[PDB]
Design a binder for these strands. Structure first.
Ligand SMILES: [Mg+2]
Ligand SMILES: [Zn+2]
Ligand SMILES: [Zn+2]
Lengths: 50, 75, 49, 1327, 149
DNA sequence: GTGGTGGATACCTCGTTGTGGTA
DNA sequence: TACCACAACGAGGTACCTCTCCACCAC
RNA sequence: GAGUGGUGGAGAGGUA
C-alpha cells in the first residue's frame, strides 16, 4: 500500500520505524491466522489454544 | 534553442545581446507582423526569434541594416 | 492515523526525497478521507438608511 | 518626468509653505454622523483636494467638463482623486521648535555647530535654564548658560543690557547671530598653533561642518522648525473596522496632539498668560512635536490608546519593516502562485508540472486575449464569465497559451543565485507543483511539504530573459565553484552504484557479447544478472585534438551493468569513465568530464538519461533495510569488558590516591575513545567484507552487497559516523558546558538505549537545534551585509592593461596540501609569463585564460607559483575589468561584460553560513661545537622542497630552536627534525670566548640565589618593576669577550659584542668558563562563523600582535615607567617613532638586532588595520583570503577565491590623504580612491605634482555606510544618521548602483540593462 | 521476541519477504522489507495550501497587492529574490516585477490592457511606494526632490 | 454627543562611538 | 594631556498559514 | 458618471 523511501532510515537514524514495521507484520500475521481460523470456522477450542 | 540556447550564444557572443536582439525581432513580429523566415511549427514569437538567430538569418547589424533599408525605401 | 502496508524500496523515483507513494486501494477504501466542518457567518448590520 | 539625480537638502519654511495647499487649523479629523471631512481639519478637502472622482463636495459639478473649477459653496477644487495623496499641508507653529533628529542623532550637529554640550542644549530645550545671547557687561560672556536663580540675579544686577532667553527661540536667535565664514576663518587660524589629537579632531570636525554648510547653501537657522508640514491624508488613511468603529493610523493621533496643544498655546499667547504657564505649555508642545518626529527617542515614548508605543515618521521610514526594506526593495507582486511541491521523475530538465487551477488563474489575461483573437470573446465580461464557467474551449486555449512560455519557480529562503529557475510548464491535474529531481539540490528542496512560488514573466524581454538566462538548463554549474550542481542525489546514485558494481560468479559470467544491445537483451531476458563479469566489444569514440571523432574498437573485461550504462553514455567519452563502480563523486565527475569535452547540449540530455536509468535500476534492485541488515560486530562486548576493567583499575588507583583527578579523567577519555575506535574498526570490517560465501574460484572474499553499507558506500545518504552510531558504539556525548561526560553511550540504535543514555543524548540534540537558530540568524545577517557592500561593482572595462597581481602558490600549510595549484589557479588570467624551466622551459603568454589544457601543461611542467591578475589589483574606476576577474564559472568561458560580480560573490560567500629535500630560508646561523644547528634570527622558516624542485611542506622555526640537519640533504619520512623547547625561549650568542660579568651587581639588578638541586650559584636577573633606585636606569649586558677581556668585533658590523638581556633570565653559567658559538646562555619561560564575520568586519582582536613600523636598530627610549618606549632608530635616518607596551605584555625581539620595514615584534593574532598599514594590499588580501578559506576548508565547502577578492576590493574603496598636492583635497579626507586616481591622472596629464594618499581598510558596516550613495546607506542601516548627515551636507546621489536603481525603478546598470545605461549616459554626456 | 512472534505467525523471521513487481511482472532481485507502519495524516492539506493570483485587491498606503490567501494576495518577491534576479542579470524581469506587476497604477493598467490586446509591452513609471517615501521625508522636514539631468 | 486629555516596571549581547576622569 | 571606564545607540533570517482583539469621558 | 474592504497594528500558535 505504501512504498516508502529506504534512504530515509540510515542517516536520519530512526530505527524505530524498522522495528515497528517488523512487529506490525508479526501482529498482522497473528491476526491473519485468527481470521483464517474463523473463516474456516475450525473450533472454539482451537481458537482458545491459538 | 527550444531546450538549450547555447548555439544562439555561440552565434551572438553574449547572453544580454542575445536577449536584446531576439526581443527586437519578436517585437517586430508581434507589432509589425513581419514573416518569420524559419518555418514556425506552431511556436511562439520568442522561441521563433531565438531559432532565427540560432539558424543565422539575423544578427544585430543584419537587423539594423534591414530596418534602415525599409526606412529608406519607405521615405 | 490508520495502519497500512508498507514496503521499503525505491520505486521509479516516485519516492525521492522524503516522499510517499500510496496505492489506489487506500483511496478506494476511503481510509484517509477526513471531515472538515467550516463555519460561515452572516450578520445583518445597520446602516443609517 | 526623467530625473537623473536625487538631490537632498534642508527645507526652508518658504519651501514648506510653497509645498503646502492650506493651513490645517482644527484637531477634528472628520465628523461622526455625516462622514465628510471638516473645514480646516486633519482631512480637510478644501486643502487636500476632492474625495470622489471628478466631483465636488456638495455635488454641484459631477463631470470631467468642469476639469478644474472651484466650488463656491465648499471651496474645493474638482480634479481626479490622485491629488488626495499628493497635496501637503502646513502647520503654523506658534513658538519655534527643535527638529529632534538634529538634537539626538549623535553627534547632534547643534552640539557640534554651536560648540556647546548636549546636556546644556537639552536643559535649554527642557525649559530649565537660560542662556544669554549677548551682553555689553563683562559679567556675562556670550553663550553663558545660567540657572534660574542666576537668571534673576542677572535681572536684579543689570536687567537691561543683556538678554537671556530660554527655549528654542533662544537657540534660533543664536543660530541667526552665529557667523559661518567668520567662525570658520577663526577655526582655520586657531587650528595651526598647537596640534593635540582630540581637540584637533573636534576642530577639524567643526571645520568640515562649517564648510559643508557654506558649500550647500543651507541655513543653520533652518534646523529650527517654524512651519511644520503635514503628510498627505491618504498616506495616514482612515478605514474603519467591520462594526463601524473607526481605526486610524498613529499619525492622526500624533497630529491631533500637536494641533490641540498648538491651539492651547495660541489661546495662552493672545490671552497673555503668566510666563511659567506659557513656558510649561511650550515645554509640552516641544515634547509633542519631538514625539511626532521620533517617539522613542527623546524620553518616555508616548504610548497609544492600546497600551503600545505610537509609530512616528522615523519609525515609518526606517526599519526591518520600514518603507525601504519593506515596500521598496521587496514588494508583494501580482501574477504569483504557491503550492506544495512534489516529485516528477517523468519530466525533463526544463519542465515543471503546473496544476490546471493555478495555471488557469495565472494566465487569465493571456486567456482573454486568445479568446478575443479566436473570435469567441467580444467583451471583457463575457471573457470573465467564460473563464469562470471553465469550458473545454477554455482548456484548449490554456493549452495553447502555455506552450513554451516559461515560469519562475522561486523558493524562499532564496539564499544563493540558483534559487530562481525558469521552466517551461506542462499541464497537470491535481494541486501540487512537480519538480525535476535534479533541481532539488540547487533549491535545497526536500519534498516533505516545502512550498514554492510561481512568478510569471510578462513581456517579450522577460520571456527571453527567462529562456536564455534563468532556464534550468543554463545554470548547470554553480558560481561558487566550477563543479556542476545537477548531480544525482541518493536514489539515482543507489541505482547507478547497483548497476556498475560486480559480483564474482553470479550468473552467466565469462560470456562474450557483441555489445550493449545484446547485453541488455540478455539482462531483460534474465539469462545473465547485472553482476556477471563478461567480455564485451565496445566501440568507444576518442575525440581528437580538433573536433573530429575517430572510432576505435577492442575487447574490455567488464560487468553487464557497465555495458548497459555505456549505451547511455554519448559519443565522445572514453570507457574508463564507466569502467569502475560509480559512487556519487564518480557520477559528478562523469558529468563534469562530459561538460568540458562536449558542451551544453549532450550534457543536458545525458543527465536526463542518467537520471532515468538510475531510477529504473534502483527500482529493479529493491534495496531494502531490515533489522538484520545492521550487523553488530560480535567482538564488541569483549573489548567493552576489557575497557571497563582497565578503567576500573585506573579509578581504583585514583581512589587509593596515586594519580590525580584531571589525569584520571583524561585517562578515562582516552580509554573510551580508543575502545570506540576499535569497535568502529571491527564494525566497518565486519560490514565491508562479508559476502564471502562464493565458489567457482574458491571461497573468495569481496566487498559486500549489504544494504546499509551500500547506501553509505555509494555516497547516497549518511557516512561512517552515522553507520557507527547505528551498529557499533554511540560514543562519548558532551554536556552543554563544553565538557565530556565520563561514561560513554556504550549502546547503539539497534540494541536500543536505556533511560540514562537517552537523557544524555538529548543534550547534544537540543544544543544542535538551538545552534541552528543562532547559526541561521547570524548567517542571514552576514549575507545581507555582504550584499549591501558589494552592490556598486559591475564589469565595466574590457581590460585595465596592468601587470600587477598576486603571486599564487598552492597553500601547503599545516601538515598537508590544502589546495592544489589546479583548484587554486584554474579560471584566472595570467599576469605575467612563467619564467622558470621546470621540465621544458615553458613560457605561457601574459593575459591568458587558464583552460584545462593549460592547467594540465603547467601541472606537467610543475610550476611552483604563478602570478595572476586579481580583482583587488585592477585599475578601473567604478568597477573592475574582465581580464582582472577571469572565468565566470556558470558558463565556462570568460566573464561577459555587465554581469554583477558583487552580488554573485556575496551570495556565494554568505550562503554556506548554514553549513558552518630540506630548504632553509632567511637564515643567519652558526654551527655550534656540537653540530646541532641553532638559528639566530626571528623570521626564519624551514621549508621542505621536492625532488622536482617544488615544495612538500613548510614550518616556521622559532629563534634559537635547534636543527639536526644541514642544507640540501634529502632526509626520508618519519624523521621529525622539529626540535624545540616548549616552555622557554633561548637567548643564545654567536661569538666565543670568556664571560666578564659586567653591568650586574647583586642587590639592585640581580638576586643572589642558589638552585635547590645542584648547589651551583645562579645569578638570575630581577625585572625592572621590583628593582631599587639604582636599577631603574640601566640595562644589564653580558659582556662576552675573548680569553683576555677584549670586547671582540663581529665581522660585518661595528657594534660591540654585548648582550642586553632582559629580566627573568636564569643565568647558570659562571665566570671563567668557555662559551661556544650558539650555546645557551639563559632561559625565559612563557569559531567558524564569528571568525568569518570578525575577519570581514575588520575588527581589532582581543590580543593585538604588536608589529614594527620602520627598518633599523631598536633600542629603548623612555625609562622609569612600566610603559617602555622603544626607539626604533633607522640605519640612515632619524627615528620619530615610539611605542607604549603594557606591563604584562612581554617582548619577543631584543634591542641588539636590526629589523626590516614592518617586522613582527609581539605575537598572537594581528589586526588587519596594521596589516594593511605596514605590509600593503596584496599581503592583506592574501591574509584575508587564506584566513576565510581556512574556515570554509575545515567544514568542507568549495569556494573560488575571486569571490573573497571581490569582497576585499569592495572593502578597500576609500583612501585617506597623508599629503595634498595641487588637487582640491585638503588633508586626511576619507575620499574615494577613484577620485584621487583621476585627480592624479589629470595632474600628471597637465604636468603637476600629484596628490599622495594612503589606503585604509574599513569593515563591511563602516564601508557600506561610508559609501557616498546615501540611498544605499539609508537602505542598509542607521537611517536617521545617514539622512541627517546627507541633509546637512546637501548631498546628491548619482544613481549608479543596483540598489538605488531598484528603489527608483529603472533597469539596473548590470546584466541586460547595462547596455541601456551606457547608452543613456553617453547620450546625456552628448548633450 | 519479535522473531519468536514471527515464527509463531509462519512468516520469514527476518521480516524481509520477496516482493514481485506489478508493473513488468518480474521479480525484484533482493528481498524487500514489508510490514504495517501506522501512518498519520497531518493538518497540512494541499487544498488549504495552494493559492494563485492574476489581478486582484490592492493596499491603500502603498498601492502594492495584498498578502494572504484570504485576501487573494500575491507572493512577496522579497529582497533575496531581488538579489537573485540581479546576479542573474535579468534587468527587464526585475523592472517589470517591481513596476507593472506591482505598485504602479498607470503602468499596470497599460500592461493589463496590452496583454488582453495581445502585445506584451511595458511602459514603466515611478513606483507608488517611492512616492510615499518622498512624501514622508518631505513631511519629516528634509527637502528631497528629483533633480532633472 | 462632542470636544479634552494627563499617571502607578526590571530578566540580551555585542559593538562601536562619544564623554568626563585622572597620572 | 593620553588611556580609560562608562554610558548611549544600534544592529540582530527569509517566505507562508491559522486564530482572536481593538480609548474613556458624560453633563 | 452605473458591485465592493483586509491590509494598518498587536498577541498567541504552526510549516520549510
Ligand atoms: Mg523539508
Ligand atoms: Zn461640492
Ligand atoms: Zn583590471
Amino acid at each position: 500500500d505504501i512504498v516508502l523511501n529506504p534512504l530515509g532510515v540510515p542517516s536520519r537514524m530512526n530505527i524505530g520505524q524498522i522495528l515497528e514495521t517488523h512487529l506490525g507484520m508479526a501482529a498482522k500475521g497473528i491476526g491473519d491466522k485468527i481470521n483464517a481460523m474463523l473463516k474456516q470456522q475450525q473450533e472454539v477450542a482451537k481458537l482458545r489454544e491459538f | 534553442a527550444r531546450v538549450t540556447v547555447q548555439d544562439a550564444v555561440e552565434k551572438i557572443g553574449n547572453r544580454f545581446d542575445l536577449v536584446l536582439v531576439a526581443a527586437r525581432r519578436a517585437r517586430q513580429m508581434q507589432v509589425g507582423g513581419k514573416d518569420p523566415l524559419v518555418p514556425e511549427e506552431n511556436d511562439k514569437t520568442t522561441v521563433i526569434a531565438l531559432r532565427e538567430i540560432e539558424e543565422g538569418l539575423i544578427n544585430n547589424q543584419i537587423l539594423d541594416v534591414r530596418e534602415r533599408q525599409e526606412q529608406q525605401e519607405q521615405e | 492515523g490508520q495502519n497500512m502496508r508498507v514496503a521499503f524500496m525505491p520505486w521509479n523515483g516516485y519516492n525521492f526525497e522524503d516522499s510517499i507513494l500510496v496505492s489506489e486501494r487506500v483511496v478506494q477504501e476511503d481510509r484517509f478521507t477526513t471531515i472538515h466542518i467550516q463555519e460561515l457567518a452572516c450578520v445583518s448590520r445597520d446602516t443609517k438608511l | 518626468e526623467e530625473f537623473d539625480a536625487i538631490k537632498i537638502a534642508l527645507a526652508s519654511p518658504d519651501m514648506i509653505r510653497s509645498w503646502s495647499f492650506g493651513e490645517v487649523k482644527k484637531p477634528e479629523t472628520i465628523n461622526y454622523r455625516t462622514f465628510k471631512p471638516e473645514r480646516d481639519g486633519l482631512f480637510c478637502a478644501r486643502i487636500f483636494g476632492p474625495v470622489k472622482d471628478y466631483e465636488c463636495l456638495c455635488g454641484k459639478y459631477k463631470r470631467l467638463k468642469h476639469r478644474g473649477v472651484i466650488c463656491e459653496k465648499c471651496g474645493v477644487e474638482v480634479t481626479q482623486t490622485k491629488v488626495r495623496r499628493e497635496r501637503m499641508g502646513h502647520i503654523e507653529l506658534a513658538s519655534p521648535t527643535a527638529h529632534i533628529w538634529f538634537l539626538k542623532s549623535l553627534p547632534s550637529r547643534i552640539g557640534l555647530l554651536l560648540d556647546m554640550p548636549l546636556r546644556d542644549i537639552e536643559r535649554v530645550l527642557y525649559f530649565e535654564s537660560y542662556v544669554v545671547i549677548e551682553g555689553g557687561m563683562t559679567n556675562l560672556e556670550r553663550q553663558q548658560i545660567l540657572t534660574e536663580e542666576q537668571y534673576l540675579d542677572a535681572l536684579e544686577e543689570f536687567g537691561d543690557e543683556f538678554d537671556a532667553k530660554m527655549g528654542a527661540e533662544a537657540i534660533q536667535a543664536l543660530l541667526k547671530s552665529m557667523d559661518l565664514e567668520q567662525e570658520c576663518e577663526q577655526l582655520r587660524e586657531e587650528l595651526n598653533e598647537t596640534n593635540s589629537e582630540t581637540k584637533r579632531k573636534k576642530l577639524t570636525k567643526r571645520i568640515k561642518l562649517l564648510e559643508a554648510f557654506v558649500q550647500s547653501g543651507n541655513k543653520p537657522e533652518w534646523m529650527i522648525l517654524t512651519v511644520l508640514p503635514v503628510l498627505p491624508p491618504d498616506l495616514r488613511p482612515l478605514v474603519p473596522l467591520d462594526g463601524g468603529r473607526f481605526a486610524t493610523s498613529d499619525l492622526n493621533d500624533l497630529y491631533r496632539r500637536v494641533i490641540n496643544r498648538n491651539n492651547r498655546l495660541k489661546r495662552l499667547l493672545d490671552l497673555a498668560a503668566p510666563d511659567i504657564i506659557v513656558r510649561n505649555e511650550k515645554r509640552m508642545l516641544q515634547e509633542a512635536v519631538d514625539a511626532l518626529l521620533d517617539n522613542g527617542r527623546r524620553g518616555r515614548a508616548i504610548t497609544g490608546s492600546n497600551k503600545r508605543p505610537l509609530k512616528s515618521l522615523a519609525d515609518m521610514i526606517k526599519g526591518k519593516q520600514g518603507r525601504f526594506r519593506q515596500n521598496l526593495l521587496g514588494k508583494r507582486v501580482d501574477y504569483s502562485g504557491r503550492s506544495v511541491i512534489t516529485v516528477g521523475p517523468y519530466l525533463r530538465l526544463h519542465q515543471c508540472g503546473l496544476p490546471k487551477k493555478m495555471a488557469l488563474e495565472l494566465f487569465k489575461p493571456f486567456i482573454y486575449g486568445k479568446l478575443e483573437l479566436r473570435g469567441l470573446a467580444t467583451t471583457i465580461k463575457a471573457a470573465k464569465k467564460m473563464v469562470e464557467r471553465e469550458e473545454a474551449v477554455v482548456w484548449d486555449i490554456l493549452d495553447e497559451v502555455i506552450r513554451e512560455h516559461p515560469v519562475l519557480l522561486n523558493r524562499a529562503p532564496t539564499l544563493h543565485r540558483l534559487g530562481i529557475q525558469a521552466f517551461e510548464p506542462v499541464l497537470i491535474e491535481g494541486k501540487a507543483i512537480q519538480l525535476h529531481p535534479l533541481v532539488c539540490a540547487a533549491y535545497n528542496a526536500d519534498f516533505d511539504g516545502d512550498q514554492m512560488a510561481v512568478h510569471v514573466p510578462l513581456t517579450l524581454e522577460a520571456q527571453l530573459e527567462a529562456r536564455a538566462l534563468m532556464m534550468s538548463t543554463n545554470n548547470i554549474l554553480s558560481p561558487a565553484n566550477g563543479e556542476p550542481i545537477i548531480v544525482p542525489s541518493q536514489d539515482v546514485v543507489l541505482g547507478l552504484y547497483y548497476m556498475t558494481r560486480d559480483c564474482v560468479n553470479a550468473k552467466g559470467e565469462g560470456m562474450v557479447l557483441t555489445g550493449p544491445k545484446e547485453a541488455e537483451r540478455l539482462y531483460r531476458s534474465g539469462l545473465a544478472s547485472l553482476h556477471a563479469r563478461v567480455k564485451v566489444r565496445i566501440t568507444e569514440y576518442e575525440k581528437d585534438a580538433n573536433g573530429e571523432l575517430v572510432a576505435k574498437t577492442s575487447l574490455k573485461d567488464t560487468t553487464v551493468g557497465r555495458a548497459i550504462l555505456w549505451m547511455i553514455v554519448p559519443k565522445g567519452l572514453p570507457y574508463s569513465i564507466v569502467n569502475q563502480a560509480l559512487g556519487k563523486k564518480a557520477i559528478s565527475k562523469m558529468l563534469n568530464t562530459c561538460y568540458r569535452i562536449l558542451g551544453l547540449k549532450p550534457t543536458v540530455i545525458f543527465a536526463d538519461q542518467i537520471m532515468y536509468t538510475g531510477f529504473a535500476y534502483a527500482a529493479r534492485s529493491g534495496a531494502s533495510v531490515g533489522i538484520d541488515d545492521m550487523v553488530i560486530p560480535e567482538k564488541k562486548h569483549e573489548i567493552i569488558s576489557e575497557a571497563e576493567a582497565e578503567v576500573a583499575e585506573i579509578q581504583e588507583q585514583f581512589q587509593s590516591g596515586l594519580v590525580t583527578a584531571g589525569e584520571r579523567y583524561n585517562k578515562v577519555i582516552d580509554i573510551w575513545a580508543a575502545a570506540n575506535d576499535r569497535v568502529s574498526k571491527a564494525m566497518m570490517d565486519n560490514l565491508q567484507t562479508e559476502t564471502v560465501i562464493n565458489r567457482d574460484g574458491q571461497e573468495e572474499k569481496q566487498v559486500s552487497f549489504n544494504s546499509i553499507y551500500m547506501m553509505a558506500d555509494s555516497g547516497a545518504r549518511g557516512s561512517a559516523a552515522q553507520i557507527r552510531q547505528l551498529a557499533g558504539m554511540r560514543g562519548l556525548m558532551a554536556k552543554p558546558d563544553g565538557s565530556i561526560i565520563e561514561t560513554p553511550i556504550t549502546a547503539n540504535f539497534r540494541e536500543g538505549l536505556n533511560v540514562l543514555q537517552y537523557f544524555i543524548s538529548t543534550h547534544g540534540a537540543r544544543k544542535g537545534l538551538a545552534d541552528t537558530a543562532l547559526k541561521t540568524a547570524n548567517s542571514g545577517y552576514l549575507t545581507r551585509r555582504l550584499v549591501d557592500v558589494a552592490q556598486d561593482l559591475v564589469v565595466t572595462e574590457d581590460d585595465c592593461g596592468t601587470h600587477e597581481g598576486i603571486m599564487m602558490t598552492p597553500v601547503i600549510e599545516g601538515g598537508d596540501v590544502k589546495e592544489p595549484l589546479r583548484d587554486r589557479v584554474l579560471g584566472r588570467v595570467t599576469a605575467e609569463d612563467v619564467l622558470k624551466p621546470g621540465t621544458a622551459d615553458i613560457l605561457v603568454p601574459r593575459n591568458t585564460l587558464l583552460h584545462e589544457q593549460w592547467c594540465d601543461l603547467l601541472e606537467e611542467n610543475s610550476v611552483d607559483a604563478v602570478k595572476v591578475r586579481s580583482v583587488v589589483s585592477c585599475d578601473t574606476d567604478f568597477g573592475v575589468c574582465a581580464h582582472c576577474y577571469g572565468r565566470d564559472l556558470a558558463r565556462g568561458h570568460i566573464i561577459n561584460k555587465g554581469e554583477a560580480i558583487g552580488v554573485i560573490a556575496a551570495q556565494s560567500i554568505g550562503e554556506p553560513g548554514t553549513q558552518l629535500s630540506i630548504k632553509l630560508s632567511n637564515v643567519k646561523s652558526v654551527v655550534n661545537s656540537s653540530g646541532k644547528l641553532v638559528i639566530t634570527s626571528r623570521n626564519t622558516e624551514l621549508k621542505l622542497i621536492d625532488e622536482f624542485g617544488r615544495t612538500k611542506e613548510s614550518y616556521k622555526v622559532p629563534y634559537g630552536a635547534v636543527l639536526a640537519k644541514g642544507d640540501g640533504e634529502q632526509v626520508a619520512g618519519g624523521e621529525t627534525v622539529a626540535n624545540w623547547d616548549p616552555h622557554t625561549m633561548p637567548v643564545i650568542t654567536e661569538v666565543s670566548g670568556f664571560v666578564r660579568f659586567t653591568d650586574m651587581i647583586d642587590g639592585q639588578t640581580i638576586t643572589r640565589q642558589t638552585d635547590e638541586l645542584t648547589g651551583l650559584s645562579s645569578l638570575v636577573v630581577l625585572d625592572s618593576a621590583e628593582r631599587t633606585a639604582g636599577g631603574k636606569d640601566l640595562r644589564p649586558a653580558l659582556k662576552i669577550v675573548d680569553a683576555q677581556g677584549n670586547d671582540v668585533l663581529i665581522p660585518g658590523t661595528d657594534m660591540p659584542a654585548q648582550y642586553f638581556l632582559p629580566g627573568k633570565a636564569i643565568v647558570q653559567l659562571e665566570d671563567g668558563v668557555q662559551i661556544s658559538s650558539g650555546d645557551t646562555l639563559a632561559r625565559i619561560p612563557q569559531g567558524g562563523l564569528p571568525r568569518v564575520a570578525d575577519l570581514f568586519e575588520a575588527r581589532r582582536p582581543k590580543e593585538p600582535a604588536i608589529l614594527a613600523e620602520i627598518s633599523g636598530i631598536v633600542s629603548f627610549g623612555k625609562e622609569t615607567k612600566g610603559k617602555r618606549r622603544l626607539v626604533i632608530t633607522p640605519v640612515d635616518g632619524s627615528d620619530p617613532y615610539e611605542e607604549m607596551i603594557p606591563k604584562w605584555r612581554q617582548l619577543n625581539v631584543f634591542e641588539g638586532e636590526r629589523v626590516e620595514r614592518g617586522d613582527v615584534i609581539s605575537d598572537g593574532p594581528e589586526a588587519p588595520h596594521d596589516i594593511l598599514r605596514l605590509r600593503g594590499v596584496h599581503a592583506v588580501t592574501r591574509y584575508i583570503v587564506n584566513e576565510v578559506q581556512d574556515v570554509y576548508r575545515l567544514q568542507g565547502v568549495k569556494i573560488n577565491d575571486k569571490h573573497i577578492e571581490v569582497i576585499v576590493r569592495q572593502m578597500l574603496r576609500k583612501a585617506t590623504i597623508v599629503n595634498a598636492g595641487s588637487s582640491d583635497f585638503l588633508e586626511g579626507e576619507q575620499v574615494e580612491y577613484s577620485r584621487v586616481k583621476i585627480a592624479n591622472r589629470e595632474l600628471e596629464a597637465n604636468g603637476k605634482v600629484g596628490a599622495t594618499y594612503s589606503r585604509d581598510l574599513l569593515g563591511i558596516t563602516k564601508a557600506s555606510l561610508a559609501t557616498e550613495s546615501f540611498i544605499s546607506a539609508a537602505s542598509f542601516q542607521e537611517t536617521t544618521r545617514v539622512l541627517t548627515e546627507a541633509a546637512v551636507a546637501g548631498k546628491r546621489d548619482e544613481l549608479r548602483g543596483l540598489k538605488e536603481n531598484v528603489i527608483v525603478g529603472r533597469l539596473i546598470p548590470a546584466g541586460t540593462g547595462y547596455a541601456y545605461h551606457q547608452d543613456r549616459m553617453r547620450r546625456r554626456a552628448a548633450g | 521476541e519479535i522473531k519468536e512472534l514471527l515464527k509463531l505467525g509462519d512468516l520469514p523471521t527476518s521480516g524481509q519477504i520477496r516482493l514481485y513487481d506489478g508493473r513488468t511482472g518480474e521479480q525484484f532481485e533482493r528481498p524487500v522489507t514489508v510490514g504495517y507502519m501506522y501512518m498519520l495524516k497531518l493538518n497540512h492539506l494541499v487544498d488549504d495550501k495552494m493559492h494563485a493570483r492574476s489581478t486582484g485587491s490592492y493596499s491603500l498606503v502603498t498601492q502594492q497587492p495584498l498578502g494572504g490567501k484570504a485576501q487573494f494576495g500575491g507572493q512577496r518577491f522579497g529582497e533575496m529574490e531581488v538579489w537573485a534576479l540581479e546576479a542573474y542579470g535579468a534587468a527587464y524581469t526585475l523592472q517589470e516585477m517591481l513596476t507593472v506587476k506591482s505598485d504602479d497604477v498607470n503602468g499596470r493598467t497599460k500592461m493589463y490592457k496590452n496583454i488582453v490586446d495581445g502585445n506584451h509591452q511595458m511602459e514603466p513609471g515611478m513606483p507608488e511606494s517611492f512616492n510615499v517615501l518622498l512624501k514622508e521625508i518631505r513631511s519629516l522636514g528634509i527637502n528631497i526632490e528629483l533633480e532633472d539631468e
